[PDB]
Amino acid sequence: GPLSVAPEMDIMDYCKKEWRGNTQKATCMKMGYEEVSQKFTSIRRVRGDNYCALRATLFQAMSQAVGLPPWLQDPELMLLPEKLISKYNWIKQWKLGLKFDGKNEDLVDKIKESLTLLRKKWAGLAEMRTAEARQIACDELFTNEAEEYSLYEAVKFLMLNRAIELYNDKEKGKEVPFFSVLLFARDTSNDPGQLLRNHLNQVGHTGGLEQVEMFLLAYAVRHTIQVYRLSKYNTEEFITVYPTDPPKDWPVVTLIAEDDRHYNIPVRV
Ligand SMILES: [Ca+2]
Ligand SMILES: [Cl-]
């Protein structure tokens, strides 16, 4: 299919096209792009569907991949679908986001296939000897075909796993990050099953990640997500980093968000 992350263009040309006229919002948005443009020259427009936040984050993480992170090296990752679904039968209420090949007879098989794909593609990008080869390959992967959407199934599953872990830690009285307190405080998300039924199952289908779920995404893929929040320009939230205090060895991916549903990718040479 066509690219789901558009070819790059100059960021101020993008701004000039998008934000015309004299409203206060238009002026704020221009100031916001001017801020971004101090560090990045170009922008790639990420498809604005209900996967937008996942697409933006994953595209940029994968396009920057020069290694395979430990969490993807871990043999346990491939074992997780069986362990979790066997333990927590309610995970079978999972809403699939593509049609899987018929070799895949159950949910465990489907999720395992998606995690295997994520691992294989990431490993292959990390092995590439030129940055150019890696962007060619990454581009090809985000072409609106089943492979692309299977990556999001993997990432959503990792988000669910991390949320289960954080919930169970809180239940054992262990220290957890505060974002997880806020995640579970939502009246539609009081436990992991509610998170799945009312939030994760909607992601890619009827809505995108909420603010609090960007923390969960960052934790799930162990990337620090640095977001220029252009709707927050004249406040301290003009950038928000998810999470605030990550391990120093998590890679950083930078995004731009005019609002919470739409993330684009700033780029530079
Ligand atoms: Ca190129
Ligand atoms: Cl024009």
Numbering used by the authors: 78 to 346
Give the article text.
Here, we reveal a previously unannotated human DUB, OTULIN (also known as FAM105B), which is exquisitely specific for Met1 linkages. FAM105B comprises 352 amino acids (aa), and the OTU domain spans the majority of the protein (aa 80–352) and an N-terminal region with predicted helical content. Having established FAM105B as a Met1-linkage-specific OTU DUB, we named the enzyme OTULIN (OTU DUB with linear linkage specificity). Crystal structures of the OTULIN catalytic domain in complex with diubiquitin reveal Met1-specific Ub-binding sites and a mechanism of substrate-assisted catalysis in which the proximal Ub activates the catalytic triad of the protease.
OTULINcat was crystallized, and its structure was determined to 1.3 Å resolution with SeMet phasing. OTULINcat adopts an OTU fold most similar to OTUB1 (root-mean-square deviation [rmsd] 2.1 Å, DALI Z score 8.7). Interestingly, catalytic triad residues His339 and Cys129 display two alternate conformations. In the “active” conformation (occupancy ∼30%), the catalytic triad is formed by interactions between Asn341, His339, and Cys129; e.g., as observed in OTUB1 in complex with Ub suicide inhibitor (Wiener et al., 2012). In the “inhibited” conformation (occupancy ∼70%), Asp336 pulls His339 away from its catalytic position, and Cys129 flips to an inactive rotamer. Linkage specificity in DUBs is not well understood, and the structure of apo OTULIN did not explain its Met1 specificity, because of its structural similarity to the Lys48-specific OTUB1. Ub-based suicide inhibitors that comprise an electrophilic group at the Ub C terminus (Borodovsky et al., 2002) covalently modify most OTU domain DUBs but showed no reactivity against FAM105B.
